[PDB]
Amino acid sequence: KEEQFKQVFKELEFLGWYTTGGPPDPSDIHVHKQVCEIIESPLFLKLNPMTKHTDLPVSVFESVIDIINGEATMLFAELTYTLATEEAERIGVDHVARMTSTV
């Protein structure tokens, strides 16, 4: 897939991975380690499609490697994030969200 996306998005790079669900779990850590075999410090994005709450159910994490009782283990630390400021994307998103004189 990388050989294929590099042909049309030459300036872009693999930054991390995503999955769906609630707060991070052991399975996410296992997979994150596999992604760490591909790139050094990957991001982890989690989307909750069954959210009960009023805020956007998207969270982003970095991995930290810590020592707890002599065991060197991987953990996630949550990062705050902002939404992109691309004008064409804003208009597209707005048009999608609205879905219906010049002034």
Partner 1 sequence: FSFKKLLDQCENQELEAPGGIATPPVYGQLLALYLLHNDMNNARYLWKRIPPAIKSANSELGGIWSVGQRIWQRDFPGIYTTINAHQWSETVQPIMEALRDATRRRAFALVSQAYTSIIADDFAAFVGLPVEEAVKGILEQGWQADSTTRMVLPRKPEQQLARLTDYVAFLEN
Partner 2 sequence: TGQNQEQFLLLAKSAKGAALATLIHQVLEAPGVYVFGELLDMPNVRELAESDFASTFRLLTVFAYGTYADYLAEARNLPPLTEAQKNKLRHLSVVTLAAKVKCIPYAVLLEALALRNVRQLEDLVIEAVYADVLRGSLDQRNQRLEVDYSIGRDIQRQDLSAIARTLQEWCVGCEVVLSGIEEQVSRANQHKEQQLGLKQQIESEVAN
Partner 3 sequence: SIDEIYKYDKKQQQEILAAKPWTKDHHYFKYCKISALALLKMVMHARSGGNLEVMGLMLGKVDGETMIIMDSFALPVEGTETRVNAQAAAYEYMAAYIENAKQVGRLENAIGWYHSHPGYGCWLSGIDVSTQMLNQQFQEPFVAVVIDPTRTISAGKVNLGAFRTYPKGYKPPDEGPSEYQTIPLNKIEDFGVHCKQYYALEVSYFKSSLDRKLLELLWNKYWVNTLSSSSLLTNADYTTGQVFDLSEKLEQSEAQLGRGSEDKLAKATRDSCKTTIEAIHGLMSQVIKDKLFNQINI
* Binding positions for partner 3, rule: CB under 8 A: 1, 4, 7-9, 49, 54-57, 83, 85-97, 99, 102-103
102 binds partner 2 (CB under 8 A): yes
Maximum alpha-carbon separation in the chain: 70
Kindly give, in sequence order, each residue whose CB lies less than 8 Å from that of residue 76, ignoring residues fewer than 6 positions away. Answer: 24, 28, 29, 32, 44, 61, 62, 63, 64
Q: Could you tell me the smallest distance in angstroms from the CB atom of residue 77 to partner 3?
A: 22
Instruction: Rank residues 80 and 102 by Cβ distance to partner 2 and give the closer one.
Output: 102
Q: Two tokens at 50?
A: 């069954």
Give the footprint of partner 1 on this chain (CB under 8 A). Answer: 101-103
